[PDB]
């Protein structure tokens, strides 16, 4: 069922710098694509991002459900929402349809604020199609192309890293993973968030 | 002060009696039943001249073989008429034959007392003069908010119903011809109006024994009846 609209997402961490990336394919009947702009990354808060991989309708439906819940939370509390709270709420939503579930394997990527000045701690985690959370503290990968990404990251991860080197690392890992999957690819985007700014870049991938 | 279904000390329900008060005002109507068929009529209480007078109709048809004549709160009356024709077509679906008029008035009376929990909220405040033809023969029936229904050879409802019943008592006779019944109905109706009788000022319907079909008289038939009307 995940061969229908195959996709992949990825996210790494570094020294006061975090990265998230995805492929831009939308499939139909497995072996014929229809679009090269379907971004699996969705901005949700000023320092929280979420990567949804799986069936496209379930990706979109889960995006609107989470956007509803999020914007409700910032409007009532009148303050910015935390990554852990969003992760727990996402796990509850995926569990709430434990039977007949959303066929989506999401991830969460963002920053953790520790007020005292303020320190931005990286945060990354991944989920099954039910909400099997597992904190990882380094590279997090999820999708049909997950095995190739797991293979690439350990060879290419260098612990904490500069944001430029992080972009090179995550870009090479994603491009080498997507080239070895037939139903995943067709371009890529790499979002590198920092406290000062976010850099969004698209890669000259084997989109063909 | 009190609920809808509160008995009086005399055993009468207050809401039912007040509903009987409401039917005392309204458009006068007259019904006659004879061997060859049934006749109904109404005074056609026209409003100001800007009204079309086609939409304002007092003689509707429950089915192909049933007519009616309303009195009292008219929106409630149309609700009762709608339920009646729905149930008659339900009979026509469940059973091939045409529904008897007695069963139709019984269902109408059953709906009228629906406010008593034994959903609606108060009595309908409507009096109907239903008429039709079936295998048993032509007949007409009377309905009122109290639920009792009584079957007639000739009757009337509305404002000038008492004088209409008196003239019908004086003039109606058994073994009557249908033309005699039509001229009798127009004589009684003309005597109980306020305005002079005319073509647009009156409406008539009838269900013949042979046709067994509802048929509202048009302007030509009404003028023909008026021209041969004694005075």
């Amino acid at each position: 069922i995940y061969n229908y609209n195959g996709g992949c997402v990825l996210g790494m961490s570094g020294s006061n710098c975090v990265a998230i990336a995805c492929d831009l394919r939308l499939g139909a009947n497995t072996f014929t694509t229809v679009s090269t702009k379907f971004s699996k990354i969705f901005k949700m808060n000023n320092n929280v991002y979420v990567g949804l991989s799986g069936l496209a309708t379930d990706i979109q439906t889960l995006y609107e459900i989470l956007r509803y819940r999020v914007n409700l939370y910032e409007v009532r509390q009148d303050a910015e929402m935390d990554v852990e709270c969003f992760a727990n709420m996402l796990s509850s939503i995926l569990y709430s349809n434990r039977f007949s579930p959303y066929f989506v394997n999401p991830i969460v990527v963002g920053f953790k604020l520790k007020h005292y000045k303020v320190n931005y701690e990286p945060y990354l985690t991944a989920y099954d199609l039910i909400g099997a959370k597992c904190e990882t503290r380094d590279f997090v990968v999820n999708g049909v192309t997950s095995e190739q990404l797991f293979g690439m990251c350990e060879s290419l991860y260098v612990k904490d890293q500069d944001e430029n080197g992080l972009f090179e690392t995550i870009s090479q890992c994603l491009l080498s993973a997507l080239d070895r999957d037939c139903i995943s690819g067709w371009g890529a985007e790499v979002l590198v968030l920092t406290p000062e700014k976010i850099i969004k870049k698209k890669l000259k991938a084997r989109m063909d | 002060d009190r609920g809808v279904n509160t008995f009086s000390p005399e055993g009468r329900l207050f809401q039912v009696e007040y509903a009987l008060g409401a039917i005392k005002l309204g458009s006068t109507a007259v019904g006659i039943c004879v061997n060859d068929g049934v006749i109904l009529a109404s005074e056609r209480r026209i409003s100001s001249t800007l009204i079309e007078k086609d939409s304002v109709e007092k003689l509707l048809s429950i089915d192909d073989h049933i007519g009616c004549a309303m009195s009292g709160l008219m929106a409630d009356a149309r609700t009762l008429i709608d339920y009646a024709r729905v149930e008659c077509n339900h009979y026509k679906f469940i059973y091939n034959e045409n529904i008897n008029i007695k069963s139709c008035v019984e269902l109408i009376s059953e709906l009228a007392l629906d406010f008593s929990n034994l959903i609606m909220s108060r009595p309908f405040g409507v009096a109907l003069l239903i008429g039709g033809v079936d295998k048993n023969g032509p007949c007409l029936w009377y309905t009122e908010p109290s639920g009792t229904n009584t079957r007639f050879s000739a009757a009337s409802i509305g404002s000038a119903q008492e004088g209409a019943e008196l003239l019908l008592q004086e003039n109606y006779k058994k073994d009557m011809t249908f033309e005699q019944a039509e001229i009798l109905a127009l004589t009684v109706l003309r005597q109980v109006m306020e305005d002079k009788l005319s073509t647009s000022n009156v409406e008539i319907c009838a269900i013949k024994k042979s046709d067994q079909t509802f048929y509202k008289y048009n302007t030509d038939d009404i003028s023909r009846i008026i021209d041969v009307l004694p005075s």
């Binding site: 509803y68 914007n71 409700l72 409007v75 009148d78 | 609920g3």
Partner: protein
Amino acid sequence: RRYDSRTTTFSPEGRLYQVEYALEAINNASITIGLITKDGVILGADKVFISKLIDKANNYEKIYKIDKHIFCGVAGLNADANILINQSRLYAQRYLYNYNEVQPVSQLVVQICDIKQSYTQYGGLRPYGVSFLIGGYDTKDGYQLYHTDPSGNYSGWFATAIGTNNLTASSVLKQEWKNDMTLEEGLLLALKTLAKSTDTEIPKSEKIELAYLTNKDGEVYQKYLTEKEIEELIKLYTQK
């Protein structure tokens, strides 16, 4: 039956007697102001003074935001306000869920006035004793401002004032308001009509609260004025 309050039941004159008492409750409340400006829409108000130990920082009890592009000012009972604020936020995010675009303010105020009309008509529950000055921006109609009431009536207003001494405030708005005007001029006029309504020559910075909504840089945002900013505004008002 014997203990019934006769809520959803017409008067002899056709008024229901309950929305009327709700409106007298509105007229005794603290005043709220509304203004539409070329740069934005403003919902200044007046705090009721309960005690000096109330937290001055934040504690915006009159103006609330329904979304990033919608925000309103309360002119009645606070609990009846806040439950309807929650319903409004629910309706906004529900429309964004259904259609994937922001809800126009006209749709939203139609929904709040519809649900308020329901308890006025259906059942035997009392109406909500609250009247809002809902304002916001949309691409269909731009900056708008409305006036809701417990009856479920709503009407558009370029500038209006509700609550106690609303006659004097509306007179000042009729005298001073202009079609095209700056945000600073609108804020100064808001201080002027608040001072006139409060029977004070100079407004007190602790006794008032201001907010504005501008579609600046193609991204609408709300600002809520702090004590220092209100002090600077009152200094400009005294200078002017």
